[PDB]
Write a protein that binds this ligand. Sequence first.
Ligand SMILES: C/C=C(/C)C(=O)O[C@H]1C(C)=C2[C@H]([C@@H]1OC(=O)CCCCCCC)[C@@](C)(OC(C)=O)C[C@H](OC(=O)CCC)[C@@]1(O)[C@H]2OC(=O)[C@@]1(C)O
Ligand code: NA
Length: 994
Amino acid sequence: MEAAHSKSTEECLAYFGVSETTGLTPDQVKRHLEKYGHNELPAEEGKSLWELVIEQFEDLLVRILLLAACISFVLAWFEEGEETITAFVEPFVILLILIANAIVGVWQERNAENAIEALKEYEPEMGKVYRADRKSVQRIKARDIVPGDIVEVAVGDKVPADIRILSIKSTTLRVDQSILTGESVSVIKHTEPVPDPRAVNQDKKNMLFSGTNIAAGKALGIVATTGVSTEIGKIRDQMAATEQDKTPLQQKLDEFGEQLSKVISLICVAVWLINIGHFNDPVHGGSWIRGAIYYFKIAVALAVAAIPEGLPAVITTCLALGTRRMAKKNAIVRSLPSVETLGCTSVICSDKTGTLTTNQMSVCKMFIIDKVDGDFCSLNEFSITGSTYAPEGEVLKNDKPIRSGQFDGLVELATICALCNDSSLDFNETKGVYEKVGEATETALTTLVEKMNVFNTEVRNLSKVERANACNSVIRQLMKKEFTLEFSRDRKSMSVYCSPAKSSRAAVGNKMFVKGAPEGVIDRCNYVRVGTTRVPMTGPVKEKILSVIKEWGTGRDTLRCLALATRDTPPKREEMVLDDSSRFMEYETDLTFVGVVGMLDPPRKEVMGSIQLCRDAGIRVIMITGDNKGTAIAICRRIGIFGENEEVADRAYTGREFDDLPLAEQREACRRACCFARVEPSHKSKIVEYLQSYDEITAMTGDGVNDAPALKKAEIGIAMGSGTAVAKTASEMVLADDNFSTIVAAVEEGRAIYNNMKQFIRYLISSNVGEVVCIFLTAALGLPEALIPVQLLWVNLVTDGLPATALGFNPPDLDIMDRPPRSPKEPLISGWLFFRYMAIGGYVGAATVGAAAWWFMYAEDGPGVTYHQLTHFMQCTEDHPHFEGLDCEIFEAPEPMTMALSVLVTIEMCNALNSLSENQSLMRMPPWVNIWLLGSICLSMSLHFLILYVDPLPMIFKLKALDLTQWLMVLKISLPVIGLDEILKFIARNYLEG
Ligand SMILES: C/C=C(/C)C(=O)O[C@H]1C(C)=C2[C@H]([C@@H]1OC(=O)CCCCCCC)[C@@](C)(OC(C)=O)C[C@H](OC(=O)CCC)[C@@]1(O)[C@H]2OC(=O)[C@@]1(C)O
Ligand code: NA
């Protein structure tokens, strides 16, 4: 299981000690199969519904909630009185809620899918090998392939493993390594070894990656590595090894629950200490046996009171809606909880070409040599119009149109652009648009020749589906394409060997047309063509050439330049090994510079603006390209990552420079850096790591399995709509339009969603605070139960839910993008706000209790002991004479309850309004600022007037309320809250922190 790409063919055959013509012997197979194991990625482990549900009941609360769902049940039986056949509702409801929860988490999860599973889609079921127990190729199962045996792949096949190529049978071999990088452009493979043992896959020309597809040809190879040890296997490992933290909100709730618990227990502790007098004053009797059940049915109350039962639903329905929302804006957010984190993204690393630019090339300038005489040198710049690959456009000199043909240098420049190009143009009808075909930069070059027919061929008479490849075809018919030497990142260029067609252009017979990066070719040039003639390349002419090269690429034009040359006296055909991409740069020498061309990959409109929004938003933006550092920087300025006259030395690094740094300075570079030039393998991931050490919520883009490990690591991995499937599944969000702007657009929606989300949370949590107080007092004052869990529930699930989810639609602040990203470690409720709900809660806690204790004391329906003795209501049936003289069951009356509850409701529809803004007054932030909020409050109210007047329902708790005096009471009890808040809100002035 090697690094075969650097070893020779005999060396790999040697290593495994196998025969290219025989293959592994069954012994070797078992031996290998044992040592190396099977050729597959570890199985997927998805817990069962049992394992699910269990987890669904691991949340401290859901547990505490369930423990109480029992006590209620245990208490609901030991009732002993038949006239209580509704004692099972309380327990039944709880379990339903609990259940309903698990019902979701189990369905929700089961539908989501990991990327480590998507990877097993690239694993072909079958493979073709050659083993010693037969002469013809045996077609076995990938699973059983082994490191060392001889394999054969061909045109249609999915490469089953990391294979070193032994020999290519077909005249050529092409592979679609797109599932790795995303680009579908097939690549040519060879046999000769690659020296560098630390080489990037991109430069492993003699290797076949498990997962990729044979584009063209047929070849035979020896399996270097299998299973997890394969390029894709490694990635699976990384992605498995990566742990993704919990959304800060889930972090915050998990905390809330932890504490919510500690308090609850403490309350009990205190409650017990409040009634510790039942040790010194109580005597032996049968009365206390009925006091236990009290301390128990008071706990289950204490629970539903504490926990914000409805919250989970409100949230998930909010995020749900925001999702669908963002979707309309092209942001496909997979995984709801991310809508939160998305909103706090500190830094955004975006690939350039796909998203920041349009990836739509077009040549804007060209320049041939005009004259070289002495030290005097003169070029011949031009300008080409037309952004679309459309053949529609004009060449100009100093803005004045020109006939390309009137220049020699140009006709060659054109032929090269036409012959040394593997791309083409096509005109579809489905949308009458001129579409690219091959490589984006070449399909441009072709377009360039259509725009400058060096031969003036008549075309205006041709149809568009012909105007496509006209001027191009003519040049193709003036030279024969013997063959072409492909691009290789070492010599960074390419060429095509050609011969003329008959004696029509037998001028000098065989020619070699080469295109590539300027630096490279220009050195391999010993001559420069001054239009139809040649002169010894010299110092000046060179400086001049390069100078314009820097202006065009570093200047505001920010163009990519391709030097163009031709080898006039190419080596003889037979003297060239056309299958050892090493002697290519060699074959491409003693060249004659004919001209350079410049093209542009136009930034996107919204981009310039989006980049600005981020500045306002305090969100850092980092560009990641393939451009040479020089143009990388230029492009950053052009869009605003940098300022035209800003220093950058320490803010832009090239893939290599970054490596040349020590782990330390490597970390610094990241907090400051805003541009990464020619980034290699790891980098994206390594970069996300550092950004996180500085505790920054970071966004990352990418689209090939090559980027999956980074997309998974980043807080918000961003995949392209046009991206691969593995990328997408590895990401949190997917830009349906690959637009960088769609990213920002989202980050904004995120900040808006959370702000509202943030409030409707405090709203409900604050109520739960008061609810608990009411339950405490009720207990500390011995007073009869002012509120029942069943009621409490309904309140928290419906009467409080509706307005809460309405609050979700609170209008958005106008400076959401003018404030720095929010801090993950920011508490939802603290300091003065803690104090407010501390009070508001206390308010309702008293308010409610008293309204029940009012219907008892000082009321005109059921007058109880106004001397306050009502407190000992437990003592009544037996203690009938001792200070009673009346019916013993008024305490069990319903209206005193419907009171405490009606005040609750109203106070809640009130508090729900004190929520439209954290520190603004309602006279500044009127309640109608959210029509929904109001509309819902109404709906909640009519529902309340439904658990009273309907029939079955009223029995399930309470009775009714006297239109006035009783309802009027409710009002002179609740309404005051608004003032209490407004007053405390007003404290936003007696301290300026509005
Ligand atoms: C739900 C009801 C209650 C009564 C509760 O115990 O909530 C506490 C609690 C656990 C927190 C507190 C509650 O503290 C109290 O209300 C004081 C105790 C009085 C009761 C004693 C009766 C004799 C929150 C509710 O309220 C106020 C206003 O004081 C605010 C906040 O919660 C949030 O930001 C919500 C998190 C989503 C948390 O301080 C939180 O602790 C944390 O870690 C946070 C950051 O979570
Ligand atoms: Na992620």
